[PDB]
C-alpha cells in the first residue's frame with residue numbers, strides 16, 4: 001500500500017537523447033532509427049525569436065549547419081526537413097538503442113512522464129497531465145527544449161510530447177512528435193496566455209478510489225447523486241463534466257472497491273461544498289487530478305515493463 | 307521555472323535488477339559485478355515469517371536452491387552468505403551493465419529515488435525522504451521487496467536503501483545495502499510500529515526558497531526571528547530543530563534570493579501559527595518537507611547526469 005506520483009522508468013528514453021546545435025543555439029533532440037527530432041527554433045537566434053520567419057531561416061541552412069552529438073561523438077547529418085514546429089534531421093547511423101516506439105497525440109486529462117534534459121543529458125523524471133487548457137505544469141529551464149514526454153506499454157514507448165516553451169504563471173507548452181502544438185500556442189516570443197484551467201473530474205474520482213483502496217476512507221458519506229446533479233455542482237467549481245465514458249472507465253475501480261461511481265460522485269460533491277476541513281487524503285490537502293484511472297490501476301496492481 | 311518532485315533517471319539501475327527465487331518465494335535482487343544482493347527473507351515461507359530463525363533456515367540452503375533470472379536468462383550461483391538482513395549471492399558472471407557505484411547510509415531528511423520493481427522488472431520511479439522516524443512513505447505491494455533507492459552523482463550511483471517491509475499506516479521500512487535496518491525494525495511478521503514522525507524543517511525552508519525563486523512569494527512577511535525563538539515554536543508543531551549546520555546548508559539559496567535564513571524562518575513561523583488560509587505554495591496546500599537544499603539547487607540550476 002501507499003500511493004505516490006510515479007513516473008515510468010526512463011532508461012529506454014535516456015538511450016534516445018542527443019544534443020542538437022545550430023550556430024549558437026543548443027537544445028535537446030530525440031534520436032530514433034536514423035532520424036533526430038527537435039524543436040524548429042534551434043535555427044533561431046534570441047533576436048530572431050521575437051518574430052521568426054521559419055521558412056526563410058531554414059532555407060538558408062544546410063545539413064552541415066546542424067551539429068548532433070550523442071555522448072562525445074558527432075552524428076553526421078545527411079538530410080533535413082521541417083514538419084510543423086519540429087525539425088527532422090536524417091543522420092547516417094541508426095540509433096542502436098532505438099526502442100519499440102510509437103508517436104501518439106494525447107487528449108486532455110491524460111498523464112505522461114517527462115525526462116527533462118539539458119545538453120542532450122538527462123537531469124530527472126516526473127509525471128505530468130495534459131491540462132484541459134492544453135498546458136502542462138512542468139519544471140523546465142533554458143536548454144530544456146526538446147525534452148520529451150512518453151508512456152510505456154510493456155516494451156513499447158509512446159512519445160506524446162516535446163517541450164518548446166513556458167507561458168505566464170510558469171506553465172509549459174509543446175508539441176506532439178509531428179510538431180503540432182497542444183493548444184493554440186505558437187513558437188514565437190510574443191505575449192500569449194493559456195485560458196482558465198479546470199479540474200479533471202474523472203482523475204479526481206480515480207484518486208479517491210486509490211484512497212479507499214489504501215484504507216483512507218474518512219470522506220465516504222452516506223449519499224448518492226445523479227450525473228446531471230453532480231455536473232451542475234461540478235460546473236460551479238470549474239470541474240470538467242463527467243460523461244458516460246468516464247463512468248465506464250472507472251468500472252474496474254468501482255468493482256474493486258464495491259463503491260458505485262455515483263456514490264463516489266456524491267462524496268466528491270460534499271468535499272467540494274465543505275472542503276477537507278484541515279484533513280488530508282493520501283497525504284494531500286487538496287483534491288489531486290493528475291492520476292488517470294489507468295494510472296491508479298497500474299500502481300495498485302504492480303504492472304511492470306520490459 | 308515550475309517546481310516538481312523529480313526522480314533521478316532510472317536507466318543505470320534498471321540494468322542491475324534481477325529476479326531471485328528460493329523455493330516458492332520470489333523477490334527482486336540487485337546485481338553488481340558478480341554479486342546479487344537481496345532481502346534475506348527470500349529464504350522464508352509465509353508461515354516461517356511469523357518468527358523465522360534465519361541462521362537455521364539458511365544453513366540448510368545450498369547455492370543451487372537459489373534461482374536468479376536476468377531477463378529470461380539464468381545466472382549460475384557459486385557462493386552465498388548472509389550479512390545482517392541481506393543475502394549475497396556470488397554468481398559466475400559479472401553484470402556487464404554494472405555502473406560506477408557506491409553503498410551509503412543516509413541520514414534522516416535525505417531524499418532518494420526508488421525504482422519499484424516486481425519479478426526483477428521495473429514498474430516505476432518516485433522520490434522519497436528518510437523520515438525522522440526511520441520510515442519512508444512509499445508505494446509498495448507484495449513482490450516489491452528488494453527494490454532499491456539511490457542517488458546519482460554525475461555517473462556514480464549511490465545505493466542507500468533496499469525495501470523489506472510495510473508497517474501500520476502504510477509506511478515502509480528497509481535496510482542499507484549492508485543489510486542494516488534504518489530504524490529499530492526487524493524482518494519478522496510481529497506487531498511493530500514507527501514512532502511519531504516530525505517535519506524536516508531544513509527541507510521546508512529549502513522548499514520555501516524554491517517558491518520564491520519560482521516567483522511565489524505571497525507568504526514572505528516583514529519579521530525576523532532568532533534560531534532559539536524559531537526552535538521554540540518549531541518544537542510545538544513537531545518540527546525538527548534547526549541547527550547551525552542547517553543554516554550553512556541553506557547558504558546558497560539564501561544568496562540566490564537575498565533572503566536571510568532567519569528572515570525565512572520568521573515567514574515559516576507565521577505559516578505555522580496562521581496556516582495558509584486556503585492558499586497554495588508551489589501548488590501545495592501544505593508545507594512540503596521532502597526536498598533537500600541540494601534537491602532544490604539541482605532542480606533550479608538544471609544539473610545533469612551521465
Ligand SMILES: *[C@@](O)(c1nc(C(=O)OC)cs1)[C@H](C[C@@H]1CCNC1=O)NC(=O)[C@H](CC(C)C)NC(=O)[C@@H](NC(=O)OCc1ccccc1)C(C)C
Nearest residue numbers: 027045140141142143144145165166187188189190191192
Ligand atoms: C528552450 O529550452 C530553448 N529555447 C532556445 C531558444 O529559443 O534559443 C534561441 C534554446 S533552448 C526554452 C525553454 C524555456 C525557458 C524557460 N522555461 C522554458 O520552458 N524555450 C524558450 O526559451 C522559448 C522559445 C520559444 C519562443 C519557441 N521561449 C519561451 O519559452 C518564452 N515564452 C514566450 O516567448 O511566450 C510566452 C510569452 C509571455 C509573455 C510575454 C512574452 C512571451 C519564455 C518567456 C522564456
Ligand SMILES: *[C@@](O)(c1nc(C(=O)OC)cs1)[C@H](C[C@@H]1CCNC1=O)NC(=O)[C@H](CC(C)C)NC(=O)[C@@H](NC(=O)OCc1ccccc1)C(C)C
Nearest residue numbers: 333351446447448449450451471472493494495496497498
Ligand atoms: C516483500 O515484497 C516480499 N515479502 C515476501 C515474503 O515474505 O515471502 C514469504 C516475498 S516478496 C514484501 C513487501 C510488502 C508487502 C506489502 N507492502 C510491502 O512493502 N514484504 C513483506 O511481505 C514483509 C516480510 C517481512 C516480515 C520481512 N512483511 C510485511 O511487510 C508485513 N509487516 C510486518 O509483518 O510487520 C509489521 C506488522 C504490523 C502489524 C502486525 C503485524 C506486523 C506486512 C503486514 C505485509
